[PDB]
Amino acid sequence: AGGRTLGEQWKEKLNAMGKEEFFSYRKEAILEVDRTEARRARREGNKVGGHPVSRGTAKLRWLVERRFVQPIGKVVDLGCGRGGWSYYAATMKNVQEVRGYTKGGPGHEEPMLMQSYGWNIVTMKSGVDVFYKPSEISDTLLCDIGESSPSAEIEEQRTLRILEMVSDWLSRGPKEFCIKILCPYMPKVIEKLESLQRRFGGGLVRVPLSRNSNHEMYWVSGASGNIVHAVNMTSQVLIGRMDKKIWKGPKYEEDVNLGSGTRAV
Ligand SMILES: Nc1ncnc2c1ncn2[C@@H]1O[C@H](CSCC[C@H](N)C(=O)O)[C@@H](O)[C@H]1O
């Protein structure tokens, strides 16, 4: 097929949007968690109330509850940030260890020290650029890296780089995985994904907690099916939410409770 993909058309229409229109559209009909108590928790220094460190936790929870991924054994979390995913994985029955890597530093999130349930099996290391980290054995591989750009070409290249690095870690045998695809609608990214699906399996899913201001999808081990179809479906939904007559806003949802306490190691 010649011409632009649907996702590229979405991207173009998104780039043309004015400030006010962008912030209404961003959350139109999306799923959102109420982070109010988690923000007050952060500022009180409450590490034992079960409040997630970020909105990421809820996204991994959406996926795990639908069995799109089932964390087990040694979990590696690439781009762990504050630890939203690392700490949620540590709450999972058959997870034994969680190792998170993240760059940190100015402008970026440092891992937060929490006492959510299983906190004692989490080890997050800041100051790590994963593109230069030699792969290690894992049973579960998580990766939540992807910096946005108005250019789909710049996003395409970013995504491919992630896919190349992710393929390394996947070749070390993890059968459970969950990987953010920044820009899944560009032809080269599709080509690579389709190849990766042949070798490692899985499928691409859109998480409804994602904002309409991005087209991020997760390549997850528990999913299957035609990648092109899944992607186009998302483009169509995101486009269908554009140019709304009246903005109804997001559907709110309760945040995840991660509890507290250590677990047997
Ligand atoms: N090359 C790189 N190496 C390590 N971390 C990176 C990186 N590029 C971006 N990052 C980090 O990856 C993080 C992705 S957002 C992390 C969200 C996390 N899953 C959660 O639930 O909290 C950002 O904090 C960013 O600092």
Side-chain angles (χ1 to χ4, degrees):
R4 285 176 168 165
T5 60
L6 233 51
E8 287 185 278
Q9 300 289 182
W10 165 85
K11 190 60 162 180
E12 282 302 289
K13 210 172 178 179
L14 179 78
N15 286 348
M17 285 192 183
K19 193 182 183 319
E20 103 81 30
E21 174 176 15
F22 176 87
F23 288 98
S24 62
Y25 172 65
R26 187 170 172 222
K27 287 189 186 195
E28 182 57 18
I30 76 165
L31 197 58
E32 188 161 278
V33 289
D34 186 14
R35 294 284 297 155
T36 296
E37 304 311 327
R39 288 194 190 86
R40 79 85 181 144
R42 177 167 180 200
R43 78 141 137 292
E44 296 183 1
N46 191 1
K47 297 176 183 168
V48 304
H51 308 92
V53 291
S54 68
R55 297 173 167 284
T57 299
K59 298 185 163 60
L60 187 48
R61 194 264 290 265
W62 193 91
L63 294 170
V64 172
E65 283 191 339
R66 285 162 186 74
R67 317 194 179 285
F68 286 123
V69 62
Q70 302 293 259
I72 186 169
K74 191 190 182 185
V75 184
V76 167
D77 179 8
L78 298 179
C80 65
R82 289 170 189 159
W85 282 20
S86 281
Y87 282 118
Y88 181 56
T91 67
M92 315 273 169
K93 172 56 185 162
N94 290 318
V95 172
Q96 289 160 291
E97 179 195 336
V98 190
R99 174 69 61 82
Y101 300 118
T102 203
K103 63 178 298 181
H108 289 274
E109 299 70 11
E110 292 292 352
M112 284 181 71
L113 301 184
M114 298 297 289
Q115 291 162 210
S116 54
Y117 175 79
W119 62 270
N120 60 303
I121 68 161
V122 182
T123 302
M124 292 189 288
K125 302 209 163 163
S126 209
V128 180
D129 181 334
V130 291
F131 299 117
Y132 301 110
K133 186 62 170 192
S135 73
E136 312 162 320
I137 295 180
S138 77
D139 301 294
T140 311
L141 185 80
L142 313 175
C143 190
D144 210 14
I145 297 174
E147 229 78 16
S148 77
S149 169
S151 182
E153 272 194 311
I154 298 186
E155 290 196 344
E156 181 184 74
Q157 217 54 46
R158 283 171 187 181
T159 304
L160 294 174
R161 191 183 191 212
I162 291 165
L163 292 184
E164 192 71 77
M165 182 259 290
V166 164
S167 173
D168 260 46
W169 289 81
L170 251 29
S171 77
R172 313 301 305 284
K175 285 164 173 306
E176 296 288 328
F177 58 82
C178 175
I179 306 293
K180 191 171 85 165
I181 314 308
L182 172 59
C183 183
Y185 55 89
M186 287 294 272
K188 278 177 179 175
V189 178
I190 284 155
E191 288 171 24
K192 183 52 168 188
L193 280 162
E194 286 179 348
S195 177
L196 282 160
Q197 204 195 17
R198 273 167 297 206
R199 193 191 165 187
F200 296 119
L204 255 67
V205 329
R206 176 66 172 187
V207 176
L209 290 137
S210 299
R211 279 56 172 280
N212 299 329
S213 58
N214 69 48
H215 204 297
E216 80 197 347
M217 294 170 84
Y218 292 82
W219 175 33
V220 284
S221 36
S224 76
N226 190 316
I227 283 162
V228 171
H229 296 168
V231 171
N232 281 327
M233 256 191 245
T234 287
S235 303
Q236 209 55 104
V237 168
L238 300 183
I239 287 160
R241 290 169 181 190
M242 286 173 162
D243 308 2
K244 282 288 176 56
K245 67 307 282 51
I246 280 286
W247 303 98
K248 300 179 63 157
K251 204 274 199 208
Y252 284 86
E253 190 190 53
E254 283 187 38
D255 204 355
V256 194
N257 174 45
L258 301 175
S260 65
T262 60
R263 74 188 295 177
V265 8

